[PDB]
PDB file of C-alpha atoms in Angstrom:
ATOM      1  CA  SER A   3       6.366 -23.974 -13.776  1.00 47.70           C
ATOM      2  CA  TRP A   4       7.467 -20.356 -13.153  1.00 46.21           C
ATOM      3  CA  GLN A   5       3.914 -19.251 -13.265  1.00 47.05           C
ATOM      4  CA  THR A   6       2.706 -21.809 -10.569  1.00 47.26           C
ATOM      5  CA  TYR A   7       5.791 -21.078  -8.299  1.00 43.79           C
ATOM      6  CA  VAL A   8       4.749 -17.214  -8.792  1.00 40.95           C
ATOM      7  CA  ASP A   9       1.109 -17.562  -8.192  1.00 35.39           C
ATOM      8  CA  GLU A  10       1.731 -19.920  -5.249  1.00 32.48           C
ATOM      9  CA  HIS A  11       4.084 -17.185  -3.864  1.00 34.00           C
ATOM     10  CA  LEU A  12       2.485 -13.800  -4.547  1.00 32.02           C
ATOM     11  CA  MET A  13      -1.051 -14.758  -3.797  1.00 31.52           C
ATOM     12  CA  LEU A  14      -5.148 -11.850  -3.035  1.00 35.46           C
ATOM     13  CA  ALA A  15      -6.707 -11.243  -6.449  1.00 31.40           C
ATOM     14  CA  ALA A  16      -3.532 -10.285  -8.026  1.00 33.93           C
ATOM     15  CA  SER A  17       0.153  -9.333  -7.038  1.00 36.99           C
ATOM     16  CA  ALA A  18       3.328  -8.310  -8.717  1.00 35.29           C
ATOM     17  CA  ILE A  19       6.783  -7.164  -8.449  1.00 32.53           C
ATOM     18  CA  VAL A  20       8.085  -4.550 -10.910  1.00 31.69           C
ATOM     19  CA  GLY A  21      11.105  -2.492 -11.040  1.00 28.29           C
ATOM     20  CA  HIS A  22      11.384   1.181 -10.545  1.00 27.72           C
ATOM     21  CA  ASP A  23      12.213   1.147 -14.282  1.00 27.65           C
ATOM     22  CA  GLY A  24       8.726  -0.599 -15.007  1.00 27.46           C
ATOM     23  CA  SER A  25      10.027  -4.004 -15.870  1.00 29.36           C
ATOM     24  CA  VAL A  26       8.266  -6.812 -14.479  1.00 27.84           C
ATOM     25  CA  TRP A  27       9.998  -9.093 -12.209  1.00 29.11           C
ATOM     26  CA  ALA A  28       7.074 -11.473 -11.348  1.00 30.24           C
ATOM     27  CA  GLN A  29       3.323 -11.000 -11.775  1.00 30.58           C
ATOM     28  CA  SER A  30       0.338 -13.328 -10.803  1.00 27.56           C
ATOM     29  CA  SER A  31      -1.641 -14.979 -13.582  1.00 30.34           C
ATOM     30  CA  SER A  32      -4.426 -12.267 -13.057  1.00 28.48           C
ATOM     31  CA  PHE A  33      -2.359  -9.125 -12.834  1.00 30.51           C
ATOM     32  CA  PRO A  34      -3.276  -6.486 -15.433  1.00 29.32           C
ATOM     33  CA  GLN A  35      -1.077  -5.297 -18.137  1.00 27.48           C
ATOM     34  CA  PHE A  36      -0.286  -1.573 -17.385  1.00 23.81           C
ATOM     35  CA  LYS A  37       1.051   1.430 -18.857  1.00 23.99           C
ATOM     36  CA  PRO A  38       4.516   3.185 -18.055  1.00 24.28           C
ATOM     37  CA  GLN A  39       2.869   6.260 -17.425  1.00 20.82           C
ATOM     38  CA  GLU A  40       0.857   4.498 -14.687  1.00 17.85           C
ATOM     39  CA  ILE A  41       4.303   3.570 -13.077  1.00 17.64           C
ATOM     40  CA  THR A  42       5.515   7.201 -13.610  1.00 17.46           C
ATOM     41  CA  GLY A  43       2.541   8.568 -11.672  1.00 14.65           C
ATOM     42  CA  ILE A  44       3.223   6.094  -8.721  1.00 14.30           C
ATOM     43  CA  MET A  45       6.764   6.894  -8.565  1.00 14.28           C
ATOM     44  CA  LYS A  46       5.997  10.475  -8.324  1.00 12.96           C
ATOM     45  CA  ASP A  47       3.600   9.887  -5.392  1.00 14.48           C
ATOM     46  CA  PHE A  48       6.270   8.147  -3.418  1.00 15.81           C
ATOM     47  CA  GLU A  49       8.179  11.266  -3.861  1.00 15.97           C
ATOM     48  CA  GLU A  50       5.490  13.867  -3.280  1.00 14.73           C
ATOM     49  CA  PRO A  51       2.775  12.500  -1.154  1.00 15.03           C
ATOM     50  CA  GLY A  52      -0.875  13.283  -2.224  1.00 16.03           C
ATOM     51  CA  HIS A  53       0.234  13.639  -5.953  1.00 13.74           C
ATOM     52  CA  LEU A  54      -2.144  10.991  -7.084  1.00 12.14           C
ATOM     53  CA  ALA A  55      -4.964  11.914  -4.973  1.00 16.46           C
ATOM     54  CA  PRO A  56      -6.405  14.581  -7.200  1.00 16.47           C
ATOM     55  CA  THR A  57      -6.632  12.062 -10.200  1.00 15.64           C
ATOM     56  CA  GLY A  58      -6.999   8.766  -8.700  1.00 12.51           C
ATOM     57  CA  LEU A  59      -4.603   5.965  -9.163  1.00 13.14           C
ATOM     58  CA  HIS A  60      -4.950   4.112 -12.371  1.00 12.94           C
ATOM     59  CA  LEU A  61      -3.477   0.705 -12.934  1.00 12.08           C
ATOM     60  CA  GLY A  62      -4.370  -1.452 -16.075  1.00 13.54           C
ATOM     61  CA  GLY A  63      -6.808   1.402 -16.877  1.00 14.93           C
ATOM     62  CA  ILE A  64      -8.704   0.878 -13.656  1.00 15.76           C
ATOM     63  CA  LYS A  65      -9.098   4.040 -11.267  1.00 17.01           C
ATOM     64  CA  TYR A  66      -8.700   3.603  -7.699  1.00 19.46           C
ATOM     65  CA  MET A  67      -9.524   6.319  -5.285  1.00 20.92           C
ATOM     66  CA  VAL A  68      -6.386   7.058  -3.127  1.00 20.88           C
ATOM     67  CA  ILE A  69      -6.856   6.802   0.643  1.00 23.04           C
ATOM     68  CA  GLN A  70      -4.494   6.990   3.634  1.00 23.81           C
ATOM     69  CA  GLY A  71      -1.075   5.451   2.842  1.00 23.70           C
ATOM     70  CA  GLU A  72       2.243   5.517   4.521  1.00 25.53           C
ATOM     71  CA  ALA A  73       4.183   8.581   3.167  1.00 26.25           C
ATOM     72  CA  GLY A  74       6.998   7.701   0.818  1.00 25.79           C
ATOM     73  CA  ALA A  75       6.755   3.970   1.490  1.00 26.16           C
ATOM     74  CA  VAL A  76       3.093   2.538   0.850  1.00 24.25           C
ATOM     75  CA  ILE A  77       0.352   3.805  -1.242  1.00 22.48           C
ATOM     76  CA  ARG A  78      -3.346   2.645  -0.868  1.00 19.06           C
ATOM     77  CA  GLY A  79      -6.363   2.842  -2.923  1.00 20.13           C
ATOM     78  CA  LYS A  80     -10.169   1.787  -3.038  1.00 21.12           C
ATOM     79  CA  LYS A  81     -12.250   0.409  -5.790  1.00 18.08           C
ATOM     80  CA  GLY A  82     -15.766  -0.710  -4.915  1.00 17.29           C
ATOM     81  CA  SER A  83     -15.636  -3.582  -2.857  1.00 19.38           C
ATOM     82  CA  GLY A  84     -11.738  -4.079  -2.947  1.00 20.47           C
ATOM     83  CA  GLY A  85      -8.616  -1.972  -3.438  1.00 21.85           C
ATOM     84  CA  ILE A  86      -4.923  -1.988  -3.901  1.00 24.44           C
ATOM     85  CA  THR A  87      -1.700  -1.669  -1.777  1.00 22.94           C
ATOM     86  CA  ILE A  88       1.732  -0.665  -3.425  1.00 23.64           C
ATOM     87  CA  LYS A  89       4.790  -0.723  -1.299  1.00 28.48           C
ATOM     88  CA  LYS A  90       8.200   0.851  -2.565  1.00 22.41           C
ATOM     89  CA  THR A  91      11.354  -1.086  -1.942  1.00 23.94           C
ATOM     90  CA  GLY A  92      14.911  -0.192  -2.829  1.00 24.15           C
ATOM     91  CA  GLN A  93      14.685  -1.416  -6.409  1.00 23.49           C
ATOM     92  CA  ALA A  94      10.996  -2.413  -6.980  1.00 26.52           C
ATOM     93  CA  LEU A  95       7.371  -2.205  -6.192  1.00 24.66           C
ATOM     94  CA  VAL A  96       5.262  -4.597  -4.525  1.00 25.68           C
ATOM     95  CA  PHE A  97       1.633  -4.745  -5.842  1.00 28.26           C
ATOM     96  CA  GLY A  98      -1.301  -6.339  -4.072  1.00 27.06           C
ATOM     97  CA  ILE A  99      -4.936  -6.219  -5.222  1.00 27.07           C
ATOM     98  CA  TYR A 100      -7.836  -7.587  -3.128  1.00 29.87           C
ATOM     99  CA  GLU A 101     -11.382  -8.166  -3.406  1.00 32.62           C
ATOM    100  CA  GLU A 102     -14.201  -8.998  -0.841  1.00 35.66           C
ATOM    101  CA  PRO A 103     -14.075 -10.563   1.351  1.00 36.21           C
ATOM    102  CA  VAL A 104     -10.477 -10.154   1.600  1.00 37.37           C
ATOM    103  CA  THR A 105      -9.349  -7.124   3.869  1.00 32.43           C
ATOM    104  CA  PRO A 106      -7.164  -4.179   3.377  1.00 28.41           C
ATOM    105  CA  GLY A 107      -5.341  -5.299   6.308  1.00 29.29           C
ATOM    106  CA  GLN A 108      -4.934  -8.798   4.908  1.00 30.59           C
ATOM    107  CA  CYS A 109      -3.655  -7.324   1.395  1.00 34.04           C
ATOM    108  CA  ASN A 110      -1.459  -5.070   3.311  1.00 34.13           C
ATOM    109  CA  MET A 111       0.076  -8.080   5.418  1.00 34.82           C
ATOM    110  CA  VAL A 112       1.048  -9.926   2.211  1.00 33.37           C
ATOM    111  CA  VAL A 113       2.570  -6.769   0.341  1.00 31.58           C
ATOM    112  CA  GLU A 114       4.671  -5.950   3.555  1.00 33.19           C
ATOM    113  CA  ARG A 115       5.948  -9.597   3.924  1.00 32.58           C
ATOM    114  CA  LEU A 116       6.852  -9.408   0.186  1.00 29.45           C
ATOM    115  CA  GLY A 117       8.727  -5.927   0.643  1.00 30.45           C
ATOM    116  CA  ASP A 118      10.618  -7.299   3.774  1.00 33.84           C
ATOM    117  CA  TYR A 119      11.722 -10.267   1.486  1.00 34.83           C
ATOM    118  CA  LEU A 120      13.039  -7.955  -1.053  1.00 34.42           C
ATOM    119  CA  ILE A 121      14.575  -5.224   0.957  1.00 34.65           C
ATOM    120  CA  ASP A 122      16.302  -7.992   3.002  1.00 32.41           C
ATOM    121  CA  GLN A 123      17.954  -9.164  -0.188  1.00 32.22           C
ATOM    122  CA  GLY A 124      19.045  -5.400  -1.100  1.00 30.70           C
ATOM    123  CA  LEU A 125      16.100  -4.947  -3.458  1.00 26.35           C
TER     124      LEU A 125
END
C-alpha cells in the first residue's frame, strides 16, 4: 500500500515530508498530527536562527529543547531520551524523530539522505 511504501522508506520513530505550506506529502504511520503555527515557527527559525530557542520547538504539542543545528538548513531538538531533526529543502521539510537507543547521528543520517533525495529532484 501507499502507507507501507512510506513507512518502509521514511523509517526512526517517525518521519515525514511536508511542504513549506504545511501540506503533508508523506508521513509515517506514527507521525503526529501538528498545527500550522508549529510549521510557521519552524519556517521562521530557518530564516532567523535562534528564533525557537527561547520557547522550545513544538510539534504535535510536544516540546523539544532546541540544541545546536545547522544555521538556515537543519534544526535539532532534544526531548528526554530522544529528539528530532528537521531539514529544510527547496520546497519541503524533512522531519525525523528518534528514540533510545537510536542516536541523533543516526536520525541525522536518514533526514539528510531524504533531503538529498528531494533536493536532487528540485524539491
